[PDB]
Paper text:
The versatile nucleotide excision repair (NER) pathway initiates as the XPC–RAD23B–CETN2 complex first recognizes DNA lesions from the genomic DNA and recruits the general transcription factor complex, TFIIH, for subsequent lesion verification. Here, we present a cryo-EM structure of an NER initiation complex containing Rad4–Rad23-Rad33 (yeast homologue of XPC–RAD23B–CETN2) and 7-subunit coreTFIIH assembled on a carcinogen-DNA adduct lesion at 3.9–9.2 Å resolution. The coreTFIIH contains two helicase-family ATPase subunits: XPB(Ssl2) and XPD(Rad3) in human(yeast), and 5 nonenzymatic subunits: p62(Tfb1), p52(Tfb2), p44(Ssl1), p34(Tfb4), and p8(Tfb5). Altogether, our study illustrates how the Rad4–Rad23–Rad33 (XPC–RAD23B–CETN2) complex recruits TFIIH to damaged DNA in 3D structural models and provides the groundwork to visualize how the NER initiation is carried out in multiple, coordinated yet distinct steps.
Numbering used by the authors:
A (entry chain 6): 107 to 457
B (entry chain 7): 423 to 766
C (entry chain 1): 168 to 355, 368 to 393, 465 to 519, 537 to 567, 573 to 639
D (entry chain 4): 22 to 94, 113 to 323
E (entry chain 0): 557 to 754
F (entry chain 2): 7 to 286, 328 to 507
């Protein structure tokens, strides 16, 4: 009795840069009573969580937020790389209440307009949190979908408790045909993990596309305190960074230089990327009676191994889920922790 | 109020009073009657007797009743035996009633089917977000001097009149105007109520308010936001139209002994289809602290917490003295108004 | 729909956006009204804002529900201008030409606000929607009745304009009876059939308005064993564990540490002349955007003359700020002037470096 | 507020000899070991009986010292048990030394040490849901030569950093060796809100330790004691090896490359680039 | 009543009307709306032309209904005469034949809502009398109609169908349980039943 | 809390050093100081040279210097150090006895007293005599509170409670009732209760044959760790042995039978300083045996139970019929009015409920908690953590029975200019120490923190 992914078969490519434009759904449907406060409040709360998470794991991307009220798509946060703006925008929205019908077509068109400036190496995306069971379009939709797939704009949507044919067509269409991206939910926890899996970059099997070197430079922190002075918000700020080339102060960020317009990063962002590129082989669960290995943990020192012949208890299993390449044991907690938070396998590091 | 809004045409439902003579023993359709006319000492004319004779003549297959608990069940049983009907109906208002005698009116009519679950009704959107409070009006020297002076029941209006009570009321008025809310005030007094109304200087319902004027103020109160505070006395209640409750203020707490609190809670708090405020139904009991009716205000608090409505107390008023019109604010003017009320 | 030159030339749109933000109009005018920048390039920086605004604008709402609803979901507010009054009426107009035409024809006389819509209730909301009123309130008069008569044949001709030769999978027409010539029976009462045709016609009109598309080793082990022994050799006198040994050494360690504590403490994680502060802030914003345009252009490249104009302007701005500092030192004295110089040091350095870099590149190209 | 100080002392007998080689052989690690024991006791006393833990890094793997994995199956005297057990284990480990131990000098398992220690911290925190443990680990390294900067451990160190920040676990480091600022460690302490201390060899640290390696449990109103600036001008070019400032980073590869593009197939992921894009870069 | 206003607010209505041409037009707009965003309702007659040949694929049909059970004797006695012939000539009684015909048309209506096995869709009925006919239905319909799903109220009906729609929406594609019910390319049939040659 | 630390600093300096002669005691009091002082002391312990103060200021950054004052005032008050105006500067250093004793303790010192423990066959079972100690503690608690039958024979203990006035009971009539002292006994759960009792034994046992140094040596040696072998045999003074026998009578010593053996280290001495887990014929279920119910509806929901514990609950709520899992009781304004008759403040009960009866309200306090502190800045509405509705009701009852408002501090003056008064008021609002202020009178009655910080800023 195990619930594990068999194997990862695109551990070669992902979209590391991103520009994901999450589009919420604020329309009369979202006011029904299936999720604890409503659909809407729970949705926005989880949206905040996802914003934090996504801007953590992909700390070099941008993001924009879009609502769908009264059949209109009203941008509530410009495509920007500072999580706090989007966070505040969502805060503001959550106190406002939905109305009108969701105009999927308008939101789609607004996005396609929005992502034009994003350069070729950056990758586009949208994430429709579609909640209702209808749309209300002021135009042909398949027209838009065709324009989309022409502009190389992958789309993933998370329907609420139903399946809508057009959305299924939409996901199947933009994502190079390979349909896996219209996942819809059946529980709140399912919803949390839905957003979580939306956080990561997105491979399926990438067509051979243009791969391009991108100019960027790293800043150096500043020293003085009273000389507070800023060139990205025109304030007094007690000390920040210096563009190596533009050579002007910039308040703390991985932002783009507001003088000479080149990307700024430290490295730790690149480190996050590295973590996403080449993950580990999924740790194997050791055979119950065939292990005969050390009775402890390895990374930690846990005493949860077996019980040695106990009718049904020992017949159950032997908590020895052990990674492959280092071939050392690890208790369940250690394996969960390694594969979730820190991806340097303890033993596999040491040799 | 409803039966013409309802499908009922009053052409057949003749209204009988023993004073309001109407068409009996000739009504082609259903009738509407009252306990006082049906069986009571208030048989000012034999119209009621003829109505009862016709009721005996026709086997009335069903009976509709509204608030039978006030009227003793003796007349109910007498007319039950007299008419020999096919079926009846009890639209009760209280869980426990004085007419729960050995022969229960339930088995006289039928079993229970639904309970007026006010927590279900006053929170789903009808009177949703019922918040209750008991503001403690600060004590002053004159009030306690009067307390020590006499121990009779004349202290009701004496502790009611507190000018700080009006200051809190005015702050509530301005706050609900800022929020665009609606305010209901329970004030059965006459002199102090009119003095407060003069002080606030706005259109107001008061004691024995004219019915046309009361309807005009209700329109300008629930529809217009320039006026949003109405003072309901003891003259209306069970004789007037219940306005939407968004902010209720109670001043007097005598109301006989009991069950009047329950009836007032059921009626004054009516459906309000507003949800802008987080607490779309405020209940307030402006009570002069350190007075005779502190015990009865605690009784009201216990009653309400039995009722299950959300209750609190707000005596840390935000900007309590920052309100306009601080007339009679000083304890000297409190004592002068106490002298005024001693006349009452 | 949105193009770089399009937003560049969308002058009315650009001025609308000027009205959009006080900060925007301020920076723009001080980049313009101060004999500064042509608006063209100024927007050439700000293009994404323009695109966003434009898209946020021309956003036709759907037809659909509200369109319909304007006949069904709208039966209560008999008062004045109800919900979405202008919005609802325009939805009506796009939804039904007849009402729009009647209202227009009844502008010079007979106000269509109260009395127009009152008679409209009867006339239309009986015509469309529910069953044939026929009897009852036949207020469908004058313009109402005329438009009724019109709309009849009008919807007729529309329906006519709707007939496709449906693909032969669905072709119920050719499917029924148009195979044979047969003799059946039939047994399965007027009016209301029109109701059904009404709902069909409404829906299809809606959909069509949407299809329109509008040492190592040895000594290593040796020393190791030595230590291992020393350990095993009882020892480990934690009393002898240094404590601090040399009081002097101790002192020196403390010195180092207090030095470092001081230096890192110097990190206290408020200008005087608020009006001059704001003025200097304006100057900084100005010089920042000016340099922004250069460091765009000086990188990118054939518009050399534009770069020349930018460089001349930037040199002018540098001299301007030099005079600004001179005036600040003259008037505010030194301490306030010192604070201003501190506030402007980074930007000043950046622009000076940009000037020097341009001078170097110009010399390189020339020589 | 109890704290789980989990020291991580690395002991390379190669680096131990280097420490003997450095300056004079005026004292082996024994000084460090004793000072560590004393500091550990100090922390063990300071708080309301808050646990500790210690891990090592010998030439051919790592192994716990204090928590003393199941083996059979004075002064407060708990100090006694901790210290005597640790020293018994460490002498046992020193028995684990020979030429085959001298063989696998290719790596330096410090990264494994930090990672495993973090896993331990997670284990303890998770089991002890009640009385949440404001934990924080340490690092002691004998700074030796023969490698100006080993980098094959670069990534796992940073993964350790990110785990630490998420777990909210400051990680302080003390390098004992030559004047070579351990850049990755330096960024590790600075980023994870730690403190760096590049002592000289032979001084009895105990003062350094008890001063600047004891203010990280759960205080943080107090100025840390870090050395000079912590410049984040990060990794040198993968191709070149010179520290980069205006980087040039390919793609899905993510490697940072110098101003010298090989023109195709960035030399860490086989990805030929658009020659049009190459020219666009060359447009300068 | 106002009932139609709500369904207007959600989906589209497309009635069925006697003239065939307009019927075809309405039907195609129904398809065009279903595959578009807005949901659309088509209501027709069981005896009518619509049920005869028209197909309802995955998108175009999710939840058929059967308001009432189709019966004819609303009208006159030609059925009575034919049924007389039936009883005299064949050992068949009236209500037997009538129920048989009714369930014939009911099954014909219902079967339209599936095309493959990837498709799916609710198939409700509505009448008191249906409960006893559960055996008259075609087998493959009867199998899915478990005992516990009889005379359900509308409310539990909505509950169950909600759970269904959600569950089917899941990509429950083990692809190893589909080796049971798909008999994959050239082999599983070959292997399985060439062995089943027993 | 009498805050024994205050009692600690009460004693003079020479006897303080007398105590510091015992290294184990030095360590045990090191456990008590505020963390700032802990760190500073650990710094100073080793470098054998005094240190100027300026460094010890620059060590601490802002937003927390108040802890700097806390630490320095505490340490100076108990005079662990010696400030030295050597060159007009401040040459801090500890009482050298403290330094040497502590340093000995860290690295194998000569504290034979701390090492008084003996290691041998500790046949003492965990439950073994642990249940007996728990039973004795329960017996004395019930007898002091007053049970239906109080078998408490602690004649010395009873004398201590009476002369100490432990509870408002008529010991002359034998009454052991809840006074302000009795209310506190109902309040201080374990550390509070054991501490108050230890202080009482100190006050009563202070006249003759004390040897306070040996007294504290014995107390902390009990609290230090399991001495085990030869404790009662050898590791005790004569008066030390008498005090040990008395404490063992008082429960706080789990000495075995035979009246002559090594020290019996009951868990209670551990409980004296641990501030940790509180759990103790032969039956004791392993679970949060505490049982009660307190929620928004103001009612008791008891499934678990404990007789003296539920009696404690009854001390402010009515009892009608004890049930199997429940006891008939409903918490209302009158319920607490019962204790208000004793005049017990509705203050200790707050944290009591937040802490006690949680063995039956774990899930309640968790759902109230909801981790709504990291989520507090995002979702501005806390989810009834530490239920404030009941808190408001309790405060309302307290005011209703109270009718009087009081404030702590002292009157302040010599605010010559409005600028200093306004700046101090702003600073206090930043630190939340100003109860009330007015520039017209230049006076108020608040805590001394603002004046302390301003004076420190002015002088140094
Ligand atoms: Zn800035
Ligand atoms: Zn720059
Ligand atoms: Zn483990
Ligand atoms: Zn591994």
């Amino acid at each position: 009795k195990k619930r594990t992914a068999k194997k990862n078969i695109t551990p070669y490519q992902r979209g590391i840069i991103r520009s994901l434009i999450l589009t919420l759904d604020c329309s009369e449907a979202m006011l029904e009573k299936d999720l604890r406060p409503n659909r809407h409040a729970m949705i926005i709360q989880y949206a905040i969580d996802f914003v934090h998470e996504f801007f953590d794991q992909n700390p070099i991307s941008q993001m924009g937020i879009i609502i769908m009220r009264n059949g209109l798509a009203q941008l509530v946060s410009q495509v920007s790389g500072n999580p706090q703006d989007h966070i505040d925008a969502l805060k503001s929205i959550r106190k406002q209440e939905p109305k009108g019908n969701p105009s999927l077509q308008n939101a789609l068109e607004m996005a396609r307009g929005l992502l034009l400036p994003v350069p070729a190496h950056c990758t586009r995306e949208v994430l429709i949190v579609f909640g209702s069971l209808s749309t209300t379009d002021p135009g042909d939709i398949h027209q838009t979908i065709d324009s989309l797939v022409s502009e190389k704009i992958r789309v993933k949507v998370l329907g609420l408790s139903a399946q809508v044919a057009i959305c299924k067509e939409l996901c199947k269409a933009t994502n190079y045909g390979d349909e896996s991206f219209y996942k819809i939910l059946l529980d709140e926890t399912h919803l949390k993990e839905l957003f979580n899996e939306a956080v990561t970059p997105l491979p399926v099997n990438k067509i051979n596309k243009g791969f391009t070197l991108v100019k960027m430079g790293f800043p150096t922190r500043i020293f003085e305190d009273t000389p507070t002075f800023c060139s990205c918000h025109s304030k007094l700020v007690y000390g920040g960074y210096f563009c190596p080339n533009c050579h002007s102060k910039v308040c703390s960020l991985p932002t783009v230089c507001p003088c000479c317009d080149l990307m700024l990063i430290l490295s730790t962002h690149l480190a996050r990327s590295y973590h996403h590129l080449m993950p580990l082989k999924t740790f194997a669960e050791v055979p119950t009676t065939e292990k005969f290995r050390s009775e402890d943990c390895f990374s930690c020192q846990s005493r949860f191994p077996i019980l040695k012949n106990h009718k049904n208890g020992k017949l159950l299993t032997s908590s020895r889920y052990r990674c492959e390449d280092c071939k050392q044991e690890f208790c369940v907690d250690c394996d969960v922790f390694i594969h979730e938070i820190l991806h340097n396998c303890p033993g596999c590091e040491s040799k | 109020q409803f039966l013409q809004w309802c499908t009922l045409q009053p052409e057949n439902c003749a209204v009988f009073t023993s004073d309001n003579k109407e068409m009996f023993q000739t009504e082609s359709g259903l009738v509407v009657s009252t306990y006082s006319m049906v069986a009571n000492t208030r048989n000012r004319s034999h119209d009621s007797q003829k109505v009862m004779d016709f009721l005996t003549g026709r086997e009335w297959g069903f009976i509709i009743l509204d608030e039978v608990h006030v009227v003793p069940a003796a007349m109910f049983r007498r007319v039950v035996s007299t008419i020999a009907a096919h079926a009846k109906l009890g639209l009760t208002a209280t869980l426990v009633r004085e007419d729960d005698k050995i022969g229960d009116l339930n088995f006289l009519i039928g079993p229970k089917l639904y309970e007026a679950n006010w927590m279900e009704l006053s929170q789903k959107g009808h009177i949703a977000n019922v918040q209750c409070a008991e503001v403690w009006c600060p004590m002053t020297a004159e009030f306690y001097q009067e307390y020590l002076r006499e121990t009779a029941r004349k202290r009701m209006l004496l502790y009611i009149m507190n000018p700080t009570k009006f200051q809190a009321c005015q702050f509530l008025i301005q706050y609900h105007e800022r929020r665009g809310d609606k305010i209901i005030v329970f004030s059965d007094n006459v002199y102090a109520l009119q003095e407060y109304a003069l002080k606030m200087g706005k259109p107001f319902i008061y004691g024995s308010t004219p019915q046309q004027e009361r309807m005009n103020i209700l329109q300008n109160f629930q529809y217009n936001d320039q006026i949003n505070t109405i003072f309901l006395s003891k003259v209306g209640d069970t004789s007037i139209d219940l306005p939407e409750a968004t902010c209720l203020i109670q001043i007097s707490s005598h109301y006989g002994s009991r069950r009047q609190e329950a009836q007032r809670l059921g009626r004054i708090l009516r459906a309000k289809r507003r949800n802008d405020e987080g607490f779309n139904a405020f209940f307030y009991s402006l009570v002069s602290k350190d007075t005779q009716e502190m015990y009865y205000s605690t009784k009201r608090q216990a009653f309400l917490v039995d009722q299950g409505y959300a209750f609190k107390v707000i005596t840390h008023l935000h900007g309590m003295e920052n309100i306009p019109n601080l007339a009679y604010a000083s304890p000297r003017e409190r004592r002068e108004l106490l002298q005024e009320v001693l006349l009452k | 729909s949105l193009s770089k030159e399009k937003l560049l030339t969308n002058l009315k749109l650009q001025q609308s956006l000027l009205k959009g933000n006080k900060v925007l109009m301020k920076v723009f005018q001080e980049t313009v009204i101060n004999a500064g920048l042509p608006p063209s390039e100024f927007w050439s920086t700000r293009i994404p804002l323009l695109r966003a605004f434009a898209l946020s604008t021309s956003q036709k709402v759907g037809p659909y529900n509200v369109l319909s609803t304007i006949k069904p979901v709208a039966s209560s507010e008999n008062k004045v201008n109800v919900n979405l009054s202008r919005e609802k009426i325009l939805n009506i107009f796009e939804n039904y030409p007849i009402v729009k035409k009647a209202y227009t024809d009844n502008v010079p006389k007979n106000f269509k606000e109260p009395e127009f819509w009152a008679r409209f209730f009867s006339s239309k909301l009986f015509r469309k929607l529910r069953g044939e009123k026929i009897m009852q309130n036949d207020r469908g008069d004058v313009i109402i009745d005329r438009y009724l008569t019109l709309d009849q044949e009008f919807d007729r001709k529309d329906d006519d304009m709707l007939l496709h030769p449906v693909k032969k999978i669905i072709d119920l027409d050719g499917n029924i009876q148009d195979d044979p010539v047969v003799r059946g029976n039939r047994p399965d009462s007027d009016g209301t059939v029109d109701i059904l045709k009404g709902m069909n016609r409404l829906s299809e009109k809606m959909i069509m308005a949407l299809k329109n598309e509008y040492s190592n080793q040895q000594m290593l082990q040796q020393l190791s064993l030595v230590m291992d022994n020393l350990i095993n050799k009882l020892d480990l006198n934690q009393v002898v564990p240094n404590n601090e040994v040399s009081n002097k050494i101790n002192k020196r360690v403390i010195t180092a540490i207090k030095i470092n504590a001081k230096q890192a403490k110097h990190n206290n994680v408020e200008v005087k002349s608020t009006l001059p502060i704001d003025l200097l802030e304006s100057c900084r914003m100005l010089h920042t955007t000016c340099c922004e345009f250069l460091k765009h252009f000086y990188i990118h490249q054939k518009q050399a003359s534009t770069v020349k104009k930018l460089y001349n302007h930037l040199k002018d701005c540098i001299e301007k700020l030099n005079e600004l500092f001179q005036d600040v030192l003259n008037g505010d004295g030194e301490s306030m002037s010192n604070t201003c110089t501190a506030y402007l040091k980074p930007v000043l350095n950046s622009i000076t470096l940009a000037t020097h870099k341009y001078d170097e590149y110009f010399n390189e190209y020339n020589n | 507020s109890p704290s789980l100080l989990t020291v991580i002392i690395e002991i390379a007998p190669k680096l131990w000899t280097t420490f003997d080689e450095e300056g004079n052989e005026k004292g082996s690690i024994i000084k460090v070991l004793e000072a560590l024991i004393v500091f550990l006791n100090a922390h063990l006393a300071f708080n309301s009986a808050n646990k500790v833990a210690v891990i090592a890094a010998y030439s051919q793997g790592i192994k716990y010292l204090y928590p003393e994995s199941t083996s059979a199956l004075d002064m407060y005297r708990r100090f006694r048990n901790v210290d005597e057990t640790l020293v018994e284990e460490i002498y046992k480990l020193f028995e684990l030394e020979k030429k085959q131990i001298e063989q696998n000098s290719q790596r330096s398992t410090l990264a494994g040490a930090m990672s495993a220690g973090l896993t331990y911290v997670n284990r303890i925190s998770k089991e002890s849901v009640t009385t949440s443990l404001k934990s924080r680990l340490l690092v002691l390294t004998c700074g030796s030569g023969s490698s100006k900067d080993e980098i094959f451990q670069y990534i796992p160190i940073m993964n350790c950093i990110f785990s630490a920040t998420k777990m909210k676990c400051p990680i302080d480091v003390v390098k004992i060796g030559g004047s070579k600022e351990s850049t990755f460690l330096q960024q590790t302490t600075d980023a994870t809100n730690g403190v760096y201390l590049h002592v000289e060899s032979t001084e009895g640290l105990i003062q350094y330790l008890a001063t600047a390696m004891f203010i990280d449990p759960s205080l943080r109103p107090i100025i840390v004691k870090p050395n000079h600036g912590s410049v984040d001008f990060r990794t040198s070019c993968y191709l070149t090896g010179r520290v980069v400032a205006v980087g040039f980073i390919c793609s899905v590869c993510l490697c940072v490359l110098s101003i010298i593009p090989p023109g195709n197939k960035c030399p860490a992921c086989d990805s030929q680039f658009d020659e049009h894009v190459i020219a666009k870069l060359k447009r300068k | 009543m106002g009932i139609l206003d709500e369904v207007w607010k959600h989906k589209l209505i497309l009635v069925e009307t006697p003239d065939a041409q307009e019927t075809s037009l309405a039907l195609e707009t129904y398809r065009k709306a279903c595959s578009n965003g807005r949901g659309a309702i088509l209501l027709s007659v069981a005896r009518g032309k619509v049920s005869e040949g028209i197909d309802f694929d995955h998108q175009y049909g999710r939840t058929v209904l059967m308001i009432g059970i189709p019966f004819q004797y609303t009208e006159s006695r030609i059925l009575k005469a034919r049924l007389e012939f039936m009883r005299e000539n064949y050992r068949i009684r009236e209500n037997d034949f009538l129920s048989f015909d009714a369930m014939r048309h009911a099954a014909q209506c219902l079967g339209r809502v599936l095309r493959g096995k990837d498709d799916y869709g609710v198939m409700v009925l509505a009448d008191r009398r249906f409960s006893r006919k559960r055996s008259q239905l075609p087998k493959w319909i009867a199998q899915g109609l478990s005992d516990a799903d009889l005379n359900l109220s509308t409310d539990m009906a909505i509950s169950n169908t909600k759970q269904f729609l959600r569950t089917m929406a899941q990509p429950t594609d083990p692809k190893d349980q589909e080796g049971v019910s798909v008999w994959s390319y050239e082999d599983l049939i070959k292997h399985q039943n060439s062995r089943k040659d027993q | 809390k009498h805050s024994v630390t205050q009692y600690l600093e009460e004693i003079p300096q020479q006897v303080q050093n007398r105590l510091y002669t015992s290294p184990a005691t030095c360590l045990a009091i090191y456990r008590i100081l505020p963390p700032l002082a802990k760190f500073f002391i650990m710094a100073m312990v080793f470098n054998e040279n005094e240190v100027p103060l300026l460094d010890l200021d620059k060590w601490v950054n802002s937003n927390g210097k108040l802890q700097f004052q806390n630490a320095i005032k505490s340490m100076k008050s108990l005079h662990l150090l010696i400030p030295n105006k050597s060159s007009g500067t401040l040459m801090i250093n500890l009482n050298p006895t403290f330094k040497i004793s502590l340093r000995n303790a860290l690295t194998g010192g000569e504290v034979q007293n701390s090492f008084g423990v003996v290691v041998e066959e500790n046949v003492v079972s965990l439950d073994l005599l642990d249940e007996y100690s728990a039973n004795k503690w329960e017996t004395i608690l019930h007898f002091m509170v007053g049970t239906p039958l109080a078998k408490i024979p602690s004649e010395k203990v009873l004398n201590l409670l009476k002369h100490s006035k432990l509870m408002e009971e008529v010991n002359s009539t034998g009454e052991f009732k809840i006074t302000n002292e009795g209310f506190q006994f109902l309040l201080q759960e374990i550390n509070s209760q054991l501490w108050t009792l230890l202080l009482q034994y100190l006050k009563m046992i202070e006249t003759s044959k004390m040897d306070l140094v040996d007294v504290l040596h014995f107390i902390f040696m009990l609290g230090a760790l399991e001495v085990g072998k030869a404790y009662k045999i050898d590791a005790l003074s004569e008066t030390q042995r008498i005090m040990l026998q008395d404490m063992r009578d008082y429960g706080l010593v789990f000495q075995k039978h035979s009246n002559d053996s090594i020290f019996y280290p009951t868990k209670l001495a551990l409980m004296l300083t641990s501030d940790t887990k509180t759990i103790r014929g032969l039956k004791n279920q392993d679970i949060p045996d505490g049982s009660l119910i307190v929620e928004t509806n103001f009612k008791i929901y008891s499934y678990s139970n404990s007789p003296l514990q539920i009696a404690v609950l009854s001390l402010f709520v009515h009892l009608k019929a004890r049930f199997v899992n429940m006891v008939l009781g409903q918490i209302t304004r009158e319920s607490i009015r019962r204790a208000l008759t004793n005049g017990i403040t509705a203050d200790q009960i707050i944290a009591y409920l937040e802490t006690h009866a949680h063995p039956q309200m774990r899930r309640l306090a968790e759902e109230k908690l909801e981790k709504k502190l990291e989520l507090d800045p995002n979702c501005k509405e806390p989810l009834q953590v530490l239920p404030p509705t009941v808190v408001d009701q309790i405060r309302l009852w307290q005011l209703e029975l109270d009718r009087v408002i009081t404030y702590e501090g002292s009157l302040y003056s010599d605010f010559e200019t409005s600028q200093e008064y306004n700046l101090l008021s702003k600073y206090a609002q930043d630190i939340g120490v100003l109860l009330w202020k007015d520039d017209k009178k230049k006076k108020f009655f608040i805590s001394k923190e603002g004046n302390s910080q301003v004076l420190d800023f002015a002088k140094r």
